[PDB]
């Protein structure tokens, strides 16, 4: 099986063999685990000040003055309690919280490969959120050479059929709902296509477009492949990147790709096949259950038990 | 009121399901549970139960122990609901047909270069779902180092070692040492 | 994650699983490991034999790499030979061309005798041998050598 390769015009111009990294099993659980750990490794620490609440002078007045026993400032004002106005925190936050998390190298690689495998399905890409109604193929390889003007980059995206995804991103810019707009996160835009390039100057023509991201094929980012921790991203591939993918996995040293496995479609097929149906065997018939009623009421109800009639009816 | 206490015991909880997030495990479990439901076959019953265990109840099996176990019945299919590892201390491996959840790479290469077969459980469920000419096998569930410390070292009938480091002598030189 | 933990399923329960008669106080037993001979003696004797006292000679400074001593069994000797030449060595068993294995090159000093060797002559060069390692090797037709 071979992927198609289209021009910057829309016509079909080449065939190229499938890279093996798309044959890896689909693991939403592993992608969620890695996405969590790595996205949590990007944080900036925060903490309250270490002197806060404790710069004033306060001591307890003791019993015998008809007041509660907390420490008090000269004059009698409450202080040094978490329940006093102007006191310290009960357990102040501290920067020695462990902010990062560790992930093994195989697990990181496996998450990248499962995200790429998900990217090559016309069903998970449509179920993730992108608009793929007018695309020729989901492994989408287009020869572009060098794009330097946004107008020509938009022209290619139109000529291939990814124009509604970028318009979805463009017409969704709004101001977010909460406190987050006081903290340099005022606007939200949706996400569209990801362009992966190898030898070809494209960033200067694609970057401006809303909802577009750039990734050089030798260093692929899981947070870009699975935004929101949802795997199937729409990827516009350069010919050179799509042709150097296998070289990249060969450059990974003492590493082999994980073994491909079957799907619930394959289990379903096996079970309904004849080699498994030939060994079935029917169960015994179930009990027959009625609701208790008084046989002595009438003649037929009694005659279910004793038909001869020796027992009187009532 | 009714008396449902005397002569009756507390009910029991066991794993009716695997709690793995792995879709391969979940699918193999549902499939073999269906086969049990429709055929009987305590073989499929035991296999369905074994696919629910907790990975300390599923030790590994080595090719050397398997060769020893399948000796003089070499024509039967060994079934292992765990990983098969390799044993470099056995210079020559015989030809065997093994079916396992996972194989190591070196184990797969040694089995194939001997001439035997490496099967999966979907392979097993397609070619033979009820285990005619299969043998279920498992490893030493009490091979863990953790299970060697259970008990009361210090009690005079224990035969179990203590846990940390103990540099003294009181109670450590036999009876009549306290 | 704070949102999946036991402690927050106790909101509205006053004491938080610590009891009304007993309660949660600062240090109702003392701090650390104190009391092991007096009021924790039942624990210390049940679970920690030989925790108190003294045993044996003491060295004021141990030489870690003098006392270092790696070891290999004879059931492992044939796995140091790469995989692609054992078949040949086994087929053409030779008194005149025998495999020479030097185990200090692999980082072992003494050779012990657990297991067995294949029926094939072999020279083994180590720095010290055990009695039954020598026995089994000289029984399969190998030779023990001492290496500098």
């Amino acid at each position: 099986p071979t992927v198609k390769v289209f021009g910057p015009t829309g016509t079909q111009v080449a065939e190229l063999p499938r890279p093996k990294v798309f044959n890896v099993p689909l693991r939403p659980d592993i992608i969620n685990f890695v996405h969590t750990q790595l996205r949590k490794c990007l944080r900036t620490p925060y903490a309250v000040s270490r002197y806060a609440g404790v710069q004033c002078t306060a001591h307890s007045w003791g019993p015998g003055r008809a007041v509660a026993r907390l420490p008090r400032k000269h004059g009698g004002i409450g202080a040094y309690a978490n329940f006093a106005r102007g006191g310290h925190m009960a357990h102040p936050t501290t920067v020695i919280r462990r902010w990062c998390r560790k992930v093994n190298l195989n697990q990181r690689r496996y998450a990248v490969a499962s995200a790429l495998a998900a990217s090559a399905n016309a069903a998970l890409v449509e179920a993730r959120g992108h608009r793929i109604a007018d695309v020729p193929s989901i492994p989408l390889v287009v020869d572009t050479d060098n794009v330097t003007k946004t107008k020509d980059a938009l022209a290619i995206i139109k000529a291939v059929g990814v124009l509604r995804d970028v318009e979805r991103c463009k017409d969704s810019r709004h101001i977010r709902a909460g406190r987050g707009k006081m903290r340099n996160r005022r606007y939200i835009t949706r996400k569209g296509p990801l362009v992966i390039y190898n030898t070809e100057d494209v960033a200067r023509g694609f970057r401006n477009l809303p909802g577009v991201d750039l990734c050089h094929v030798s260093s692929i980012r899981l947070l870009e492949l699975a935004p929101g921790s949802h795997p199937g991203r729409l990827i516009l591939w350069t010919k050179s990147a799509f042709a150097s993918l296998d070289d990249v996995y060969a450059a990974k040293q003492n590493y082999t790709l994980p073994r491909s496995c079957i799907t619930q479609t394959d289990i379903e097929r096996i079970l309904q096949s004849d080699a498994v149906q030939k060994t079935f065997v029917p169960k015994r018939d179930p009990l027959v259950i009625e609701r208790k009623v008084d046989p002595f009421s009438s003649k037929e109800a009694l005659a279910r038990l004793d038909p001869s009639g020796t027992v009187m009816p009532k | 009121g009714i008396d449902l206490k005397t002569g009756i015991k507390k009910r029991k909880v066991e794993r009716k399901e695997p709690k793995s997030p792995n879709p391969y495990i979940r699918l193999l479990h549902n499939a073999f549970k269906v086969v049990y439901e429709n055929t009987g076959e305590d073989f499929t019953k035991v296999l369905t139960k074994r696919l629910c265990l907790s990975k300390t109840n599923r030790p590994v099996l080595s090719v050397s122990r398997l060769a020893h176990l399948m000796h003089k019945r070499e024509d039967k299919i060994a079934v292992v609901a765990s990983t098969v590892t390799n044993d470099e201390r056995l210079v020559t491996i015989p030809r065997m047909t093994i079916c396992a959840l996972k194989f190591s790479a070196t184990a797969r290469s040694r089995i194939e270069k001997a001439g035997g077969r490496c099967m999966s459980f979907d392979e097993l469920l397609a070619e033979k779902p009820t285990g005619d000419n299969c043998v279920l096998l498992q490893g030493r569930r009490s091979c863990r180092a953790v299970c060697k410390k259970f008990g009361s070292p210090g009690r005079p009938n224990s035969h179990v070692k203590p846990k940390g480091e103990h540099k003294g002598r009181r109670g450590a030189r036999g009876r009549h040492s306290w | 994650p704070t949102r999946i933990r036991k402690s927050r399923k106790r909101r509205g329960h006053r004491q938080m699983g610590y009891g009304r008669v007993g309660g949660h106080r600062k240090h109702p037993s003392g701090r650390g490991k104190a009391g092991g001979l007096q009021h924790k003696r039942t624990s210390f004797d049940k679970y920690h034999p030989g925790y108190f006292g003294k045993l044996g000679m003491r060295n004021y400074h141990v030489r870690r790499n003098i006392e270092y001593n790696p070891t290999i069994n004879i059931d492992k000797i044939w796995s140091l030979i790469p995989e692609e030449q054992r078949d040949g060595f086994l087929q053409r068993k030779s008194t005149t061309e025998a495999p020479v294995v030097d185990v200090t090159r692999f980082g072992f000093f003494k050779v012990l005798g657990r297991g067995s060797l294949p029926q094939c002559p072999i020279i083994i060069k180590a720095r010290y041998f055990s009695s039954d390692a020598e026995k089994k090797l000289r029984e399969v037709g190998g030779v023990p050598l001492l290496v500098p």
Partner: peptide, 30 residues
């Protein structure tokens, strides 16, 4: 009956008074 190995960790020193004994690694990428 608790069967645990005794922790061999030293008590913290100078946590709020003396010289700063806590070294962070927020600067290693820089």
């Amino acid at each position: 009956g608790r069967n645990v190995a005794f922790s061999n960790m030293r008590r913290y020193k100078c946590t709020n008074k003396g010289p700063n004994l806590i070294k962070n690694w927020f600067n290693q990428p820089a």
